[PDB]
Every structure is written in structure tokens, then in C-alpha cells.
Design a protein around this ligand. Structure first.
Ligand SMILES: [Zn+2]
Ligand SMILES: [Zn+2]
Ligand SMILES: [Zn+2]
Ligand SMILES: [Zn+2]
Ligand SMILES: [Zn+2]
Length: 147
DNA sequence: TAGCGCCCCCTGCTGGC
DNA sequence: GCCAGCAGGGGGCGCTA
């Protein structure tokens, strides 16, 4: 924000409250992660990130879809899932204007369709070049009996 | 501080084409 | 094989009480 009073003494960012600067410095500069999982080595800057992480250990899925049986561990994942029902495609490739349901899909599109000289994968068993690593995985399972 | 969201990242698979 | 759809784990910030 323009007049944000709390300037970071280590980068160009500034914040409206000192609490926001404190948290930003923990994330980006000092890396103090006060909140520690008791079941693995995970630790986080914010407690809410620990709580979300714990749901991966327990399987808790608090956020139920009202149109199907899906339920998520994170409110945003449910909002992302609702795009499968609405057909919303919020992301647009600035180069060719194709639209996508997720931002990562769009980034991958730009890598595969609008980027010069991208390194490709190669099947060693049949001498086929494959663009995406996951499609090399599929090829190995489908054509070379990877179990 | 904890707590609510908003949103992006990276990963890696699926099935239509 | 190419492609966009689509979910899991996670980082970082906006904002408030
Ligand atoms: Zn900073
Ligand atoms: Zn853990
Ligand atoms: Zn649903
Ligand atoms: Zn494009
Ligand atoms: Zn092969």
C-alpha cells in the first residue's frame, strides 16, 4: 500500500502493521518457524499452516462440496474444486488467450507452447522423445510394462 | 498474537483428443 | 503422445480483533 509505515530493512516491501512486517521477516529473512509438528519434522511460520498440515496426518477434510462427495483439507482447494462444476476458467494465456481452470496449468501451457528450446524427455527403450515428464511415465507404464 | 480469508507454487496423475 | 483438467502438500501475504 502507498503509505505503508513498516518498511522491511532487508527488501523493498512495506506493511501497514508491525505484526505484518514481523511475519514477513520470519517467512523471508530470519526463517523462524515457531510452530512444530509433533509427528514429523514439519514446521511453519503461522499456526494455521501447522493446523492445515496436521490434517494431512489425520485425513480430516472439513470443507464439504455441496454438489458432490468431494471434501477438502483447505478452503481454497474447495473453491478450486467448484470450478469443476461451474466451468469457470479464470486464467488466460497472455500470448494466445487460451483459458484454464488453474494457474499451474496455464504456466505449463506457456512452457510447452510458447517457450523456445525446452529440454525434452527421452524413452531409453524405444527412442521416442516425449515433452512432459509425466507423459514419459505414462509411456513407460503403457508400452514397457512398468509395474 | 491467533485467526479468517485469498491466491499462487510445485507436483504428478487422468482421460479426451 | 499432446493437452488441459484436476487434486494433494505447501508458502506468503491482506486484514482484523
Ligand atoms: Zn523483506
Ligand atoms: Zn507432520
Ligand atoms: Zn463437488
Ligand atoms: Zn497460449
Ligand atoms: Zn519407449
Amino acid at each position: 500500500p502507498l503509505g505503508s509505515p513498516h518498511k522491511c530493512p532487508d527488501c523493498d516491501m512495506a506493511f501497514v502493521t508491525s505484526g505484518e512486517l514481523v511475519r514477513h521477516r520470519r517467512y523471508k529473512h530470519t526463517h523462524e518457524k515457531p510452530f512444530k509438528c509433533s509427528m514429523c519434522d514439519y514446521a511453519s511460520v503461522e499456526v494455521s499452516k501447522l493446523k492445515r498440515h496436521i490434517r494431512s496426518h489425520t485425513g480430516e477434510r472439513p470443507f464439504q462440496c455441496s454438489l458432490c462427495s468431494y471434501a477438502s483439507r483447505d478452503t481454497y482447494k474447495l473453491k478450486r474444486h467448484m470450478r469443476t462444476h461451474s466451468g469457470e476458467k479464470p486464467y488466460e494465456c497472455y500470448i494466445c488467450h487460451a483459458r484454464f481452470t488453474q494457474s499451474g496449468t496455464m504456466k505449463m501451457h506457456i512452457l510447452q507452447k510458447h517457450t523456445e528450446n525446452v529440454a525434452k524427455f527421452h524413452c531409453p527403450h524405444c527412442d521416442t522423445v516425449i515433452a512432459r515428464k509425466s507423459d514419459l511415465g505414462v509411456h513407460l507404464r503403457k508400452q514397457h510394462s512398468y509395474i
